Design a protein around this ligand. Structure first.
Ligand SMILES: Cn1ccc(C(=O)Nc2cccc(C(=O)O)c2)n1
Length: 165
């Protein structure tokens, strides 16, 4: 089960950890991927999760896209968790580096409410370009289910905890 997490609110928890390593240890029911609309798991959390599945997540995702077309920014899809989790909830947060509307971050987090417990990264943080402090605030104000946030970067983790209102 989840260990070493700091409780932020009644339902949001945070830990300075590699989400891939957290997933392999916990094997949660749901691991959230920081996905793009095309499910092209190239870099950041998506690239790391996909590489941990030996590219099985990408093969599965390409078949999903061939059948269904791309996701919407703010949307999600449930696919296999492979060796990491029972399921992977691929959530598309807005990518600020691609000029996408930051207001879609709340819609993206609403996808977590369909799952009772999730292991997740901060949406739109990292290479997506949004302020991680803002992402954590939208997370605690939007997600009502139990979310265990894994923040890879130690310095960012410390900044997030020390600035949490
Ligand atoms: C105001 N602003 C926008 C972006 C940032 C910012 O510090 N982003 C950032 C930088 C380094 C790592 C990570 C991460 O999620 O791993 C995120 N600050």
């Amino acid at each position: 089960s989840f260990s070493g997490y700091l409780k932020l609110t009644d339902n949001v928890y945070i830990k300075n950890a590699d989400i891939v390593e957290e997933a392999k240890k916990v094997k949660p029911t749901v691991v959230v991927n920081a996905a793009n609309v095309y499910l092209k798991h190239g870099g950041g959390v998506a690239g790391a999760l996909n590489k941990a599945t030996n590219n099985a997540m990408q093969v599965e995702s390409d078949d999903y896209i061939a059948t269904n077309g791309p996701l919407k920014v703010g949307g999600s899809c449930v696919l296999s968790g492979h060796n990491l989790a029972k399921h992977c909830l691929h959530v598309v947060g807005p990518n600020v580096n691609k000029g996408e509307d930051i207001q879609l971050l709340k819609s993206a987090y609403e996808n977590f409410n369909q799952h009772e417990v999730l292991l997740a990264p901060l949406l739109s943080a990292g290479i997506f370009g949004a302020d991680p402090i803002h992402s954590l605030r939208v997370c605690v104000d939007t997600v009502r289910t139990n979310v265990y946030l894994a923040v890879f970067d130690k310095n960012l983790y410390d900044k997030l905890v020390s600035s949490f209102l």
